[PDB]
RNA sequence: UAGGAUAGGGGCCUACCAUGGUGGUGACGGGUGACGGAGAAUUAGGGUUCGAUUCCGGAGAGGGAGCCUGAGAAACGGCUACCACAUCCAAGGAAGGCAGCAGGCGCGCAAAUUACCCAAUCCUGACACGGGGAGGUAGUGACAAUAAAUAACAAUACCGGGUGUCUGGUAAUUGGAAUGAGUACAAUCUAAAUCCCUUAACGAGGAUCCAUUGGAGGGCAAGUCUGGUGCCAGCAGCCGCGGUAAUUCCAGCUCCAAUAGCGUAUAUUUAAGUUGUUGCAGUUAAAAAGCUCGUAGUUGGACCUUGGGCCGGCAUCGUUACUUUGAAGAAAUUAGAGUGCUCAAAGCAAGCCAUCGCUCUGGAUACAUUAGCAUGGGAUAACAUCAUAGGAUUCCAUGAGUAAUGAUUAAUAGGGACAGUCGGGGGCAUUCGUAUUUCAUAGUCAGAGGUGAAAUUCUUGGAUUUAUGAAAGACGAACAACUGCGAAAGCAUUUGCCAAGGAUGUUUUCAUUAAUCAAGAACGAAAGUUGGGGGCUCGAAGACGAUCAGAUACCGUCCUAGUCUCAACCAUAAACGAUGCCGACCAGGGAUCGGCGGAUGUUGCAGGACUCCGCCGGCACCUUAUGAGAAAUCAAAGUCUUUGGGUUCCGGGGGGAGUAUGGUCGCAAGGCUGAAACUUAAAGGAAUUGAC
């Protein structure tokens, strides 16, 4: 059964990205999916995306710009403090120069650099680079 | 495939605990049978030369390996120990005092010698190497 | 090493299929696996039809046909040249000859 | 897919986006309420009351015209059945299967279907107990089940 | 519950009463070559292994038990008894406890002096003062570890590189200088001695003041040198070497690696992504349970603050996980700041004007899982709380108000209902068919049968063959398909009945009810077992004929159990797609089955048959990677070092072996669970070239 809609969204988006598609459809939508997409768009890895209200769960149509190499969730959502971020950076990321890890801290959903800025920890949602 | 739940620590721990037994080395060490070997978990041992024997080397080799049937003094078991360094069978006599060691493969036959896992290191309190190189004489 | 995708038979979506018996050796072979042919021939051949034509009482008698569906096991079919051994690339060719 | 099969069929209904009832519906809430209550008096049930409303009386969806579901309406009026409809029909089917299987002891395919339907009955009963829709002392007794239906 | 006892709580014990307490979240029981911890080794990270030993806690004084004194002991360098040892003895008795220091025996692969002293650190006593095998000092000590000699320079002779000069290298050649290993006055060290540090005098040329341990085929740096041996002796961790020319054995020379260190054996860390949480595998290499149901466990759709800018009191409260900050946190060890012990491993010292002293000299700081305590955060998660209002808010001692009155939507999640269908899905009864065998009637006469060829067998009493008819049992051809149904096994003549099911259609209903599943259950080809019936054909066992060197086989004929059925057992198959189930995404194409929507123009007849388009569901098929893979190949076996959707089972080189034994189910045959000793360097998968 659909146990993690975030994984389905990220996997469909990555599969469409590898095939050179310019748009991708994500169903069902959710607030955490929207926040993850907002972070990715703010850092400049995707472009426009619009939520469509189907009165049941909503869909998302996302516009790709070819800049996204990989994006994927981490399951189960392990708990990381501020001192463990570096370790996870050495595991999920290509290099220390770029890449991003998404954390769902109690201050919201953000990237790992912002979490270090605010000195807060939380669980790991996924990653993208 | 694997159980990836965050609440599934017990399942993973128990599964690994069960599956460690298929390991050859782990099962060898944790079954406790290593104490029933002649050395009983000792690096060396001491013994009495019961007799001097020769064993034909396994095919395709062709030679006679000068071994020695000895009896350990710590438990009374009878084992065959190799005698290297040609001419060193002469130094060994009957009912003599020898120090035996493993052959090198940790309880496995070494070389073409059929079923020999020990080698003679000392005889009558003198090393075979010293007698072989004429550094020492048998007392 | 799997020589054939279908395993040498024609079974999909079912578990059991009743067998038949080879017409030469009477060996039980699954119905779909057996080499089945339908042979239709004159009762009397060309050397005989001429001599039976005038011997027939009336000219309106059409010569009767005979129809037989025969089944062969793989061994009998190969030994009788019903089906030969084909090359690796020609094995997949399911097109009937002519 | 199906809980007790290998099917993957997806046939179902598709409610319209417009939640408001259509303009041509000129039936007041009182008429719909009286019709539902009369049907419940006539031994009907919510699933087979909704279809009667949809077909004969031109009511596309009860939740639109009256603003509430059929079961909620019946419970507010106090005419709701003591047993939920789905459990009632599952129990009826199991009773029929047992009645047939009593005389056919070699029909070892209806025994398997009986096991399946009893498993579904028990799962539904457990769910209805968890939400206090059934008495906590409720229990599915096969011998006396037929008396219930 | 009430007492007793204890310093005190308490079934700690007594009387009475009740039937409770723990357990697949592993109780109970067993093993430990198990004292626990701080810690040790190796460590990219995670980890694996160890932890008798000097710091903390516990326990013991040969093995158990009992006790006195005392503030403190169930004390043993205290007593009493028993058991086991063992000591004198005048044979009546007496005295014992090194797992304290040293030493001895024994055990072993395995561990030093029966030395000196209270000088230091501290402890104890009436005590400044005695004492201390605690502790320190010397002796042995290649456990481990730090620094570091065994020669440097010039000339001459020889040989190289930038006719010539310079540079650079070798000579048991020639010179001089330098020095400590050693020896020793002496002082210093020290409780007293000794070692070190310092230093008179002596002390190096083959500077004999003499470097060793392993190797020289590959892995792996170094010889196809010489002599010996001749599948012998031997070497060889693995591959391998030696059979008269040995680069591998025995030696010489030469060379290589490490160097005052090296070799060997065991244990285990890495290597090992060959234990895989990070991070392995399961079509064919070992490894998906025959199939489905199913509790515990694990895992579970979406939805509810955003705009908002700025920037001492006083309550009474959903609970947690997570995350931040704080506190408390033994030292030693580890990381780490300072510091020139001559350096270093170390130590916690010291440094400076050249003092009748100073720097208040320093003697930092982290980490320290988990559990516990406290502060802030509320994103992500778990629990119950959610519509009979039994709801919230008012008035009425020192009943009327009251409000926005209170219910998220209905998942291309699931269940149930309904409608027309669909299927070789199931049970019961019933109907039909040719063939086979048997029998009955009738006809003719010489062979029939079977074989590569024959015989065993039948036959003038008529075999084989022909026609008619009856009976019996089994079996359902052709139609029949890269077609259908079923959880799988499996299911194929007609008709009636009975219950069930998928898919499709739906503006019907409920509202998370779900996925997978230890334990526990249904069903499970064929063969097999217990009885009853039936018993045509075929046919394990058996017999005979034939072939053959032989034939307990393949080929012929006759046949028993069986093959069919009813009531019970078994629980296995190449039970196969050698591919567990659920979910999402990612190429194209045509055909086909079921349902539905539309168009279409023909039927000796709206609808049915046919044609065209589309949607959902299913069995498959074809082409191609831009994918994967050891490849065969796979549109899933793809979306994997750019590794993580959920969940069950299961593999760890080949044998021994699915064997032994225990447990358990079965009437039995057997099924489920299931080792070890020992042996072995390969076994195996896919593809390639030859040979056959
Ligand atoms: K075939
Ligand atoms: K007490
Ligand atoms: K006292
Ligand atoms: Mg083959
Ligand atoms: Mg099917
Ligand atoms: Mg089958
Ligand atoms: Mg009391
Ligand atoms: Mg009592
Ligand atoms: Mg112990
Ligand atoms: Mg300890
Ligand atoms: Mg000690
Ligand atoms: Mg202690
Ligand atoms: Mg004690
Ligand atoms: Mg003792
Ligand atoms: Mg005592
Ligand atoms: Mg003592
Ligand atoms: Mg004591
Ligand atoms: Mg030692
Ligand atoms: Mg040599
Ligand atoms: Mg080399
Ligand atoms: Mg030679
Ligand atoms: Mg592996
Ligand atoms: Mg195989
Ligand atoms: Mg296999
Ligand atoms: Mg299977
Ligand atoms: Mg959720
Ligand atoms: Mg038929
Ligand atoms: Mg069909
Ligand atoms: Mg089970
Ligand atoms: Mg099996
Ligand atoms: Mg169709
Ligand atoms: Mg194995």
TrEMBL record, chain A:
Taxonomic source organism: Triticum aestivum (Wheat)
Gene Ontology process terms (BP): translation
Gene3D superfamilies xrefs: 3.30.1370.30, 3.30.1490.10
Family: Belongs to the universal ribosomal protein uS8 family.
Alphabetized UniProt keyword annotations: Ribonucleoprotein, Ribosomal protein
An MF annotation (GO) of this entry: structural constituent of ribosome
Listed InterPro entries: Ribosomal_uS8, Ribosomal_uS8_CS, Ribosomal_uS8_sf
Key word Ribosomal protein present: yes
Gene: LOC123079681
Name this polypeptide is given: Small ribosomal subunit protein uS8c
Function: One of the primary rRNA binding proteins, it binds directly to 16S rRNA central domain where it helps coordinate assembly of the platform of the 30S subunit.
UniProt-listed SUPFAM superfamilies: Ribosomal protein S8
Source domain of life: Eukaryota
GO CC list: cytosolic small ribosomal subunit
Subunit (UniProt): Part of the 30S ribosomal subunit.
From TrEMBL, chain B:
InterPro entries to which the protein is assigned, alphabetical: NA-bd_OB-fold, Ribosomal_uS12, Ribosomal_uS12_euk/arc
Keywords: Ribonucleoprotein, Ribosomal protein
Gene3D superfamilies (alphabetical): Nucleic acid-binding proteins (2.40.50.140)
GO BP terms: translation
GO terms of molecular function: structural constituent of ribosome
Assigned GO CC terms: cytosolic small ribosomal subunit; ribosome
Sequence segments annotated as region (Disordered): 1-25
Composition bias, Basic residues: 10-19
Entry similarity comment: Belongs to the universal ribosomal protein uS12 family.
The protein, known as: 40S ribosomal protein S23
Protein source organism: Triticum aestivum
UniProtKB/TrEMBL annotation, chain C:
First-to-last residue of the parent protein present: 2 to 99 of 139
Annotated positions binding Zn(2+): 22, 25, 73, 76
Keywords: Metal-binding, Ribonucleoprotein, Ribosomal protein, Zinc
Family: Belongs to the eukaryotic ribosomal protein eS26 family.
Taxonomy, superkingdom: Eukaryota
The name this protein goes by in its record: 40S ribosomal protein S26
Organism: Triticum aestivum
GO molecular function, one term: mRNA binding
UniProt GO BP: translation
Metal-binding recorded as keyword: yes
GO cellular component terms given for this protein: cytosolic small ribosomal subunit
Automatic annotation (TrEMBL), chain D:
SUPFAM superfamilies with a match to the protein in the record: S15/NS1 RNA-binding domain
GO cellular component: cytosolic small ribosomal subunit; nucleolus
CDD domains: Ribosomal_S15p_S13e
Record-level Gene Ontology MF annotations: small ribosomal subunit rRNA binding; structural constituent of ribosome
Record Pfam families: Ribosomal_S13_N, Ribosomal_S15
UniProt key word Ribosomal protein: yes
A biological-process GO annotation: translation
Domain Small ribosomal subunit protein uS15 N-terminal: 1-59
Record key words, sorted: Ribonucleoprotein, Ribosomal protein
Keyword Nucleotide-binding belongs to the record: no
Coiled coil region boundaries: none
PANTHER family, A to Z: RIBOSOMAL PROTEIN S15P/S13E, SMALL RIBOSOMAL SUBUNIT PROTEIN US15
The family this protein is said to belong to: Belongs to the universal ribosomal protein uS15 family.
Name of protein: Small ribosomal subunit protein uS15 N-terminal domain-containing protein
């Amino acid at each position: 059964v659909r146990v993690s809609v975030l994984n389905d969204a990220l996997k469909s988006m990555y599969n469409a990205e590898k095939r050179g598609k310019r748009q991708v459809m994500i169903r069902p939508s959710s607030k955490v999916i929207i926040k993850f997409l907002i972070v990715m768009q703010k850092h400049g890895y995707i472009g426009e995306f619009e939520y469509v209200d189907d009165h049941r769960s909503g869909k998302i149509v996302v516009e790709l710009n070819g800049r996204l190499n990989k994006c994927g969730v981490i399951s189960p959502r392990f708990d990381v403090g501020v001192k463990e971020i570096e370790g996870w950076t050495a595991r999920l990321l290509p290099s220390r120069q770029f890449g991003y890890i998404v954390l769902t801290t109690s201050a919201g959903i953000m990237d790992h650099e912002e979490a270090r800025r605010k000195n807060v920890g939380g669980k790991v949602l996924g990653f993208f680079y | 495939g694997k159980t990836r739940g965050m609440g599934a620590g017990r399942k993973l721990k128990t599964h690994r605990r069960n599956q460690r037994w298929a390991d050859k080395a782990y099962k060898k060490s944790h079954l406790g049978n290593e104490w029933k070997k002649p050395f009983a978990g000792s690096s060396h041992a001491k013994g009495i030369v019961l007799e001097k024997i020769g064993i034909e080397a396994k095919q395709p080799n062709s030679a006679i390996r000068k071994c020695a049937r000895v009896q350990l003094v710590k438990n009374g078991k009878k084992i065959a120990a190799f005698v290297p360094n040609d001419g060193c069978l002469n130094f060994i006599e009957e009912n003599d005092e020898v120090l035996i060691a493993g052959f090198g493969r940790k309880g496995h036959a070494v070389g073409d010698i059929p079923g020999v896992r020990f080698k003679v290191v000392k005889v009558s309190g003198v090393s075979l190497l010293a007698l072989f190189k004429e550094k020492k004489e048998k007392p | 090493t799997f020589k054939r995708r279908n395993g040498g038979r024609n079974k999909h979506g079912r578990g059991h299929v009743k067998y038949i018996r080879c017409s030469n050796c009477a060996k039980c072979c699954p119905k779909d696996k057996a080499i089945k042919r339908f042979l239709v021939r004159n009762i009397v051949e060309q050397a005989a039809v001429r001599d039976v034509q005038e011997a027939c009482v009336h000219d309106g008698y059409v010569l009767p046909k005979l129809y037989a569906k025969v089944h062969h096991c793989v061994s009998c079919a190969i030994h009788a040249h019903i089906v030969r051994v084909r090359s690796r690339e020609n094995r997949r060719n399911r097109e009937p000859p002519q | 897919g199906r809980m007790h099969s290998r099917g993957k069929g997806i046939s179902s209904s598709a409610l319209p986006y417009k939640r408001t009832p259509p303009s041509w519906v000129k039936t007041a809430v009182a008429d719909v309420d009286e019709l539902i209550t009369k049907a419940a008096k006539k031994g009907q049930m919510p699933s087979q009351i909704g279809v009667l409303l949809r077909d004969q009386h031109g009511i596309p969806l009860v939740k639109s015209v009256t603003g509430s579901k059929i079961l909620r309406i019946l419970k507010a009026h106090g005419l709701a059945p003591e047993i939920p409809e789905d459990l009632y029909f599952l129990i009826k089917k199991a009773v029929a299967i047992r009645k047939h299987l009593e005389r056919n002891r070699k029909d070892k395919d209806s025994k398997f279907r009986l096991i399946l339907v009893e498993s579904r009955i028990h799962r539904l009963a457990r769910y209805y107990k968890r939400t206090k829709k059934l008495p906590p002392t409720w229990k599915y007794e096969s011998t006396t089940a037929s008396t219930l239906v």
